[PDB]
PDB file of C-alpha atoms and ligand atoms in Angstrom:
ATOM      1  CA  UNK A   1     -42.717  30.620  -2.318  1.00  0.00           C
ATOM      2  CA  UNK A   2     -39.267  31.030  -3.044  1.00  0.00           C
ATOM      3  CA  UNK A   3     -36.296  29.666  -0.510  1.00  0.00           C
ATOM      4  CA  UNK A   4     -36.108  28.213   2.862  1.00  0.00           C
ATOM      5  CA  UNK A   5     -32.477  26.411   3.108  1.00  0.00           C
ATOM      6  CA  UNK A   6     -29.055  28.597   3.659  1.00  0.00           C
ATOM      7  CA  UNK A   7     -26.983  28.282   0.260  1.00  0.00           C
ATOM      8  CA  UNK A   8     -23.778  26.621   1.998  1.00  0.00           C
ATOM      9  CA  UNK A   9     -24.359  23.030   2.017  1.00  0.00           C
ATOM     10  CA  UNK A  10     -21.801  21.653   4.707  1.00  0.00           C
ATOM     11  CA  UNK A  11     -22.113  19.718   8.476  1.00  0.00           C
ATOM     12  CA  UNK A  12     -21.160  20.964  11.647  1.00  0.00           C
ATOM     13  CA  UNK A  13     -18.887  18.255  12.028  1.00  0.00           C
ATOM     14  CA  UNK A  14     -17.126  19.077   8.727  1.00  0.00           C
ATOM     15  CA  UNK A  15     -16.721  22.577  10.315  1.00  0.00           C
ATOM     16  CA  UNK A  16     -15.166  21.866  13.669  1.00  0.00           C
ATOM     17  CA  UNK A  17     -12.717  18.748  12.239  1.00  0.00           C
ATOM     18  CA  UNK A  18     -12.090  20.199   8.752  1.00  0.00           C
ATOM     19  CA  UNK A  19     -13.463  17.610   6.486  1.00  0.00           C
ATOM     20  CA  UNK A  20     -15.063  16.956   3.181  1.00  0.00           C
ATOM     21  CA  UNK A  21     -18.654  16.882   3.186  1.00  0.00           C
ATOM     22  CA  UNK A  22     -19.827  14.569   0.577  1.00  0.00           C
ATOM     23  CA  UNK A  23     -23.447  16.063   1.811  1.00  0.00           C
ATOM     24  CA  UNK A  24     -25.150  12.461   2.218  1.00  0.00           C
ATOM     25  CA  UNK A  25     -27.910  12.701   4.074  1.00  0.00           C
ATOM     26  CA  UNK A  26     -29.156  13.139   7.016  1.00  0.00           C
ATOM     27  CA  UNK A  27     -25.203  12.559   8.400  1.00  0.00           C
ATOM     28  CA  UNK A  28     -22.437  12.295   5.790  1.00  0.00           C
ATOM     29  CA  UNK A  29     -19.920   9.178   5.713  1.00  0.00           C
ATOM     30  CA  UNK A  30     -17.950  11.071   8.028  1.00  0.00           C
ATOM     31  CA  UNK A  31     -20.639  11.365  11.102  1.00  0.00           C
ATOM     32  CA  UNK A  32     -21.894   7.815   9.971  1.00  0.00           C
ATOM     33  CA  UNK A  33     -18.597   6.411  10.417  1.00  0.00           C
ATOM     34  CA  UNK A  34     -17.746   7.823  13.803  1.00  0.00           C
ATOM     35  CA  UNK A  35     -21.542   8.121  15.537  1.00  0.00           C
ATOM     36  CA  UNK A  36     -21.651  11.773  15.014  1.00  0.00           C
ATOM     37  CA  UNK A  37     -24.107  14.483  15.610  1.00  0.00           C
ATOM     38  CA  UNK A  38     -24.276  15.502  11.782  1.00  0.00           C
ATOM     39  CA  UNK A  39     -26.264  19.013  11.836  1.00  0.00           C
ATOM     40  CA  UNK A  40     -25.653  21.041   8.697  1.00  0.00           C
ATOM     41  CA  UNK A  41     -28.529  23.325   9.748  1.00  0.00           C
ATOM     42  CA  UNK A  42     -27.412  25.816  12.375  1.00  0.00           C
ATOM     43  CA  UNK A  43     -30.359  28.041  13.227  1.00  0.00           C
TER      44      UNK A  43
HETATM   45 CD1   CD B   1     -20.069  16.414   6.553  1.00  0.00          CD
HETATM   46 CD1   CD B   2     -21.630  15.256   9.021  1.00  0.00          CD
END
C-alpha cells in the first residue's frame, strides 16, 4: 500500500504549449479555457 501516481504533477497540454499548470482538476484553467484534452497521466 504505498504509491500509485508519478511524482511530476503537470498536463499534457502544459507540456506541448509550455504553460503553467496550476494542477486544477480534472483540466487546469488552461484546458478549461480553450476545450482541451487535459491528461496529466501518460501511461
Ligand atoms: Cd495544465
Ligand atoms: Cd491541462
Amino acid at each position: 500500500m504505498k504509491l500509485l501516481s508519478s511524482i511530476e504533477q503537470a498536463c499534457d497540454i502544459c507540456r506541448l504549449k509550455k504553460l503553467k499548470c496550476s494542477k486544477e482538476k480534472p483540466k487546469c484553467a488552461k484546458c478549461l479555457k480553450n476545450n482541451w484534452e487535459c491528461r496529466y497521466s501518460p501511461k
